[PDB]
RNA sequence: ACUAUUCCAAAAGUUAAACUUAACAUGGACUAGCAAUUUCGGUUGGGGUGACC
Protein backbone atom coordinates (compact mmCIF):
# COMPACT_ATOMS: atom_id res chain seq x y z
CA UNK A 1 0.00 0.00 0.00
CA UNK A 2 0.56 3.79 -0.24
CA UNK A 3 2.96 4.82 3.06
CA UNK A 4 4.38 8.05 3.84
CA UNK A 5 8.11 7.54 5.12
CA UNK A 6 9.11 9.16 8.71
CA UNK A 7 13.00 8.95 7.74
CA UNK A 8 14.87 8.39 4.55
CA UNK A 9 15.87 4.13 4.51
CA UNK A 10 17.98 2.60 1.36
CA UNK A 11 15.99 3.42 -1.84
CA UNK A 12 12.31 4.60 -1.96
CA UNK A 13 12.39 8.46 -2.00
CA UNK A 14 12.68 11.70 0.08
CA UNK A 15 11.40 11.52 3.62
CA UNK A 16 8.59 12.30 4.14
CA UNK A 17 7.31 11.34 0.40
CA UNK A 18 4.30 9.44 -0.27
CA UNK A 19 5.76 5.67 -2.08
CA UNK A 20 4.06 2.58 -2.34
CA UNK A 21 6.01 -0.58 -1.10
CA UNK A 22 5.58 -4.47 -0.78
CA UNK A 23 3.06 -5.58 1.57
CA UNK A 24 5.54 -7.45 3.72
CA UNK A 25 8.40 -4.92 4.06
CA UNK A 26 5.68 -2.29 4.60
CA UNK A 27 3.55 -3.64 6.79
CA UNK A 28 6.55 -5.97 8.94
CA UNK A 29 8.69 -2.86 9.52
CA UNK A 30 7.86 0.06 8.42
CA UNK A 31 4.73 0.49 10.30
CA UNK A 32 5.70 -0.98 13.63
CA UNK A 33 8.67 0.57 13.77
CA UNK A 34 7.50 3.83 13.16
CA UNK A 35 9.82 4.25 10.25
CA UNK A 36 6.60 5.23 8.06
CA UNK A 37 2.77 5.40 8.27
CA UNK A 38 -0.50 4.37 6.34
CA UNK A 39 -1.56 7.14 3.75
CA UNK A 40 -4.35 9.56 5.44
CA UNK A 41 -5.01 12.68 3.07
CA UNK A 42 -5.16 14.63 6.53
CA UNK A 43 -1.58 13.87 7.51
CA UNK A 44 -0.84 13.93 3.42
CA UNK A 45 -1.70 17.58 3.89
CA UNK A 46 0.74 17.37 6.51
CA UNK A 47 3.11 15.76 3.76
CA UNK A 48 2.65 18.90 1.23
CA UNK A 49 2.99 21.03 4.55
CA UNK A 50 6.47 20.20 5.57
CA UNK A 51 8.03 19.29 2.12
CA UNK A 52 7.05 22.77 1.14
CA UNK A 53 8.73 24.33 4.25
CA UNK A 54 11.20 21.85 3.48
CA UNK A 55 12.83 23.46 0.01
CA UNK A 56 11.76 26.85 1.52
CA UNK A 57 13.80 27.32 4.49
CA UNK B 1 -18.62 -14.61 7.75
CA UNK B 2 -15.24 -17.03 8.17
CA UNK B 3 -15.43 -18.74 11.50
CA UNK B 4 -17.53 -22.29 11.14
CA UNK B 5 -18.32 -22.18 7.50
CA UNK B 6 -19.78 -25.44 6.05
CA UNK B 7 -20.68 -25.69 2.54
CA UNK B 8 -20.84 -29.04 0.14
CA UNK B 9 -18.42 -29.96 -1.98
CA UNK B 10 -18.98 -31.93 -5.52
CA UNK B 11 -16.35 -34.05 -7.68
CA UNK B 12 -16.27 -32.39 -11.37
CA UNK B 13 -18.30 -29.07 -9.70
CA UNK B 14 -21.19 -30.19 -12.27
CA UNK B 15 -23.54 -32.71 -10.18
CA UNK B 16 -25.55 -36.02 -11.40
CA UNK B 17 -23.08 -37.34 -8.87
CA UNK B 18 -22.71 -37.77 -5.09
CA UNK B 19 -22.74 -34.14 -2.91
CA UNK B 20 -20.81 -34.48 -0.10
CA UNK B 21 -21.03 -31.87 2.94
CA UNK B 22 -17.33 -30.14 3.84
CA UNK B 23 -16.66 -27.56 6.29
CA UNK B 24 -14.53 -24.71 6.01
CA UNK B 25 -12.89 -23.12 8.95
CA UNK B 26 -10.35 -19.35 8.51
CA UNK B 27 -7.21 -19.56 9.12
CA UNK B 28 -5.53 -18.44 12.24
CA UNK B 29 -2.30 -16.10 12.96
CA UNK B 30 -0.57 -13.62 15.86
CA UNK B 31 -0.84 -9.92 15.00
CA UNK B 32 0.76 -7.57 17.03
CA UNK B 33 -0.49 -3.84 16.77
CA UNK B 34 -0.39 -0.68 19.27
CA UNK B 35 -2.84 1.53 20.62
CA UNK B 36 -1.42 4.79 21.87
CA UNK B 37 -5.69 5.87 22.46
CA UNK B 38 -5.26 2.77 25.64
CA UNK B 39 -1.09 3.16 25.87
CA UNK B 40 -1.46 -0.77 25.33
CA UNK B 41 0.25 -3.14 22.87
CA UNK B 42 -2.71 -5.77 21.55
CA UNK B 43 -2.58 -8.88 20.13
CA UNK B 44 -5.41 -9.87 18.01
CA UNK B 45 -5.60 -13.52 16.53
CA UNK B 46 -8.24 -12.15 13.76
CA UNK B 47 -8.94 -12.24 10.36
CA UNK B 48 -5.82 -12.05 8.67
CA UNK B 49 -7.69 -10.23 5.28
CA UNK B 50 -9.98 -8.10 7.78
CA UNK B 51 -6.73 -6.50 8.36
CA UNK B 52 -5.52 -5.38 5.26
CA UNK B 53 -8.99 -3.48 5.35
CA UNK B 54 -7.80 -1.99 8.91
CA UNK B 55 -4.46 -0.75 7.21
CA UNK B 56 -6.87 1.50 4.96
CA UNK B 57 -9.29 2.19 7.48
CA UNK B 58 -6.69 4.41 9.02
C1' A C 1 -13.12 -37.95 5.69
C1' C C 2 -7.77 -39.92 8.07
C1' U C 3 -1.82 -41.33 7.34
C1' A C 4 2.40 -39.51 3.76
C1' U C 5 3.87 -36.16 -1.21
C1' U C 6 3.93 -32.05 -6.06
C1' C C 7 2.82 -26.84 -6.83
C1' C C 8 1.01 -21.95 -5.77
C1' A C 9 -0.07 -18.91 -1.71
C1' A C 10 0.89 -17.03 3.99
C1' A C 11 5.67 -15.82 6.68
C1' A C 12 11.64 -14.52 5.60
C1' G C 13 16.12 -13.08 2.49
C1' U C 14 18.61 -11.80 -2.33
C1' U C 15 20.56 -8.88 -6.64
C1' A C 16 19.97 -5.41 -11.18
C1' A C 17 18.06 -0.85 -13.43
C1' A C 18 13.63 -10.24 -12.49
C1' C C 19 14.84 -14.86 -8.27
C1' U C 20 15.93 -18.04 -4.18
C1' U C 21 14.54 -20.39 1.68
C1' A C 22 10.77 -23.19 5.37
C1' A C 23 11.16 -24.09 12.50
C1' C C 24 5.56 -24.04 14.77
C1' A C 25 0.21 -23.45 13.08
C1' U C 26 -3.20 -22.83 9.02
C1' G C 27 -5.14 -23.03 3.03
C1' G C 28 -6.36 -23.97 -2.51
C1' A C 29 -6.16 -27.93 -6.18
C1' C C 30 -3.18 -32.66 -6.76
C1' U C 31 -0.73 -37.90 -6.54
C1' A C 32 -0.70 -42.95 -3.63
C1' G C 33 -1.91 -46.31 0.26
C1' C C 34 -6.55 -46.58 3.46
C1' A C 35 -11.99 -45.84 3.91
C1' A C 36 -17.55 -44.34 2.05
C1' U C 37 -22.32 -45.55 -0.66
C1' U C 38 -25.21 -49.37 -3.75
C1' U C 39 -26.00 -52.70 -7.92
C1' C C 40 -25.84 -57.89 -8.71
C1' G C 41 -31.48 -59.18 -15.96
C1' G C 42 -35.25 -62.06 -18.08
C1' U C 43 -36.91 -66.40 -20.83
C1' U C 44 -36.31 -71.54 -18.46
C1' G C 45 -40.93 -78.71 -18.29
C1' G C 46 -37.32 -76.27 -10.59
C1' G C 47 -32.85 -73.53 -10.32
C1' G C 48 -27.83 -73.27 -11.85
C1' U C 49 -24.75 -74.37 -16.16
C1' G C 50 -25.44 -74.06 -21.43
C1' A C 51 -28.36 -71.51 -24.95
C1' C C 52 -31.51 -67.50 -26.25
C1' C C 53 -33.27 -61.91 -26.21
Request: proline content about 2%; glycine content about 2%.
Given at each position: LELVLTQSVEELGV??????????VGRNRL???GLAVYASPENKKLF???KLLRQEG | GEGWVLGHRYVNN????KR????WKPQLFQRELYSEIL???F????????????????
Open positions: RGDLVSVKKSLPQEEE | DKLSVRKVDKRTVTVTMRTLDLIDQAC
